[PDB]
C-alpha cells in the first residue's frame, strides 16, 4: 500500500570482479540496507545456467553466520541477487600481514566459522570455496558464509555424492583435490577452515599449494613447526591444526571432533565491552 517502498538507491561499490558487481542499496522509503549482487548473464555462455544454481542454493539458506537471501529481480540479461549487507566487510581486512589477530578473537571467528560449515553440511551443501575473502562481518562482528556461486549439492535423499570438480583457491584446497579423481566434499571444506585459522592467527598463507613439489608443505608433513608460520602459532591451537592439516582426507579431524578440540573449547575471549558505570 506504502508507495515507493520497493525502489533501492545503488549508493557504493562493495565488490567487483569477473561475476560482475556487488552494490549498497538502499530503500528510498525505510533507509534498510542490503547488498546486490548484480550479474549480466551475456558475460557467459552458461551463466543462466550457473546463476539459476546459486539462487537455487541461496533460497535452502537460513542460518545466522550465513548471508541470508531476500530474493532476485531479473530484467532482461541482467539479474539482481537481494543480501544480507555486511557492514563489517572482509575477514580478509581483519588479518595484519605477518601478524594475524589476538588469538582470542581468531577462536572466535572460528566458531562462528564452524556453526555455519556445520549448517550447511547438514543441509547437503558444500561451499567449495571457503577463504578470508568470503567470510563476512556484520555491524557487531559476526562471521557470515558468502559467495554461493561455487556451491553444490553433495547430499540429497540421504545418499552422498562424491565430487570430482576441481574448484576453489590453491592456497586454500584440500590436496586429495590435486592427487585423486573423486573426494569426499566435508573434508575439503575442513581443509580450507584450516588455512584460515592459520591465516587468522600468522598473518600469512603457509603454501602456494598442497603438493610435495611445493617445499612449505614438505616441510609441514615433515613436522618442521619451528618455521613460520607455525612458529607464530600456540601449541594449543598448533595441536589443532595438526588434527586438520592432514593428507589422507578419511584420518582428517571431523567436525565433530573439532569441536571437542582443547583449544576450541578453551576460555579465551571476553563477551562485547557493555557500558557500565560505577558509585
Ligand atoms: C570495515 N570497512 C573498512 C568498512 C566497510 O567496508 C566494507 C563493507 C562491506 C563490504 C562488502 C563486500 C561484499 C561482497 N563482496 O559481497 C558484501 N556483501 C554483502 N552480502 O554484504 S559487503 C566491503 C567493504
Same mark, same amino acid.
Request: aromatic fraction near 8%; glycine fraction near 6%.
Given at each position: ?22 552494490? @549498497?542499496? &538502499? ?30 542454493? /541461496? ?9 541470508? +537471501?531476500?530474493?532476485? !529481480? ?7 541477487? +537481494? ?8 575477514? +580478509? ?24 560449515? &556445520? ?22 562482528? /559476526? ?7 561455487? *556451491? ?17 583457491? @590453491? ?11 573423486? +573426494?569426499?566434499?566435508?573434508? &575439503? ?9 592459520? *591465516? ?37 591451537? @598448533? *595441536?589443532?591444526?595438526?588434527?586438520? @592439516?592432514?593428507?589422507?582426507?578419511? *584420518? ?23 557500558? !557500565?558505570?560505577?558509585?
Amino acid at each position: 500500500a506504502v508507495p515507493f517502498v520497493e525502489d533501492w538507491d545503488l549508493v557504493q561499490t562493495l565488490g567487483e570482479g569477473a561475476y560482475g558487481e556487488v552494490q @549498497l542499496a &538502499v530503500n528510498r522509503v525505510t533507509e534498510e540496507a542490503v547488498a546486490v549482487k548484480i550479474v549480466d548473464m551475456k558475460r557467459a555462455v552458461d551463466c543462466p545456467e550457473n546463476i539459476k544454481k546459486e539462487i537455487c542454493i /541461496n533460497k535452502m539458506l537460513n542460518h545466522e553466520n550465513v548471508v541470508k +537471501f531476500y530474493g532476485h !529481480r531479473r530484467e532482461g540479461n541482467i539479474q539482481y541477487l +537481494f543480501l544480507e549487507y555486511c557492514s563489517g566487510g572482509e575477514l +580478509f581486512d581483519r588479518i595484519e600481514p605477518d601478524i594475524g589477530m589476538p588469538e582470542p578473537d581468531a577462536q572466535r571467528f572460528f566458531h562462528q566459522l564452524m556453526a555455519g560449515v &556445520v549448517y550447511l553440511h547438514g543441509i547437503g551443501i558444500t561451499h567449495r570455496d571457503i577463504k578470508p575473502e568470503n567470510l563476512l562481518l556484520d555491524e557487531r562482528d /559476526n562471521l557470515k558464509i558468502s559467495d554461493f556461486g561455487l *556451491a553444490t549439492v553433495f547430499r540429497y535423499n540421504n545418499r552422498e555424492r562424491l565430487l570430482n570438480k576441481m574448484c576453489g583457491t @590453491l592456497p586454500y584446497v584440500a590436496p586429495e583435490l590435486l592427487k585423486r579423481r573423486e +573426494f569426499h566434499a566435508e573434508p &575439503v571444506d575442513v581443509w580450507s577452515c584450516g588455512i584460515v585459522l592459520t *591465516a587468522m592467527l600468522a598473518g600469512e598463507l603457509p603454501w602456494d599449494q598442497p603438493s610435495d613439489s611445493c617445499q612449505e608443505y614438505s616441510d609441514w608433513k615433515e613436522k618442521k613447526t619451528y618455521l613460520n608460520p607455525w612458529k607464530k602459532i600456540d601449541s594449543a591451537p @598448533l *595441536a589443532l591444526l595438526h588434527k586438520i @592439516l592432514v593428507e589422507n582426507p578419511s *584420518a582428517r579431524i571431523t567436525i565433530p571432533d573439532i569441536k571437542k578440540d582443547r583449544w576450541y573449547n578453551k576460555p579465551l575471549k571476553k563477551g562485547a565491552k557493555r557500558p !557500565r558505570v560505577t558509585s
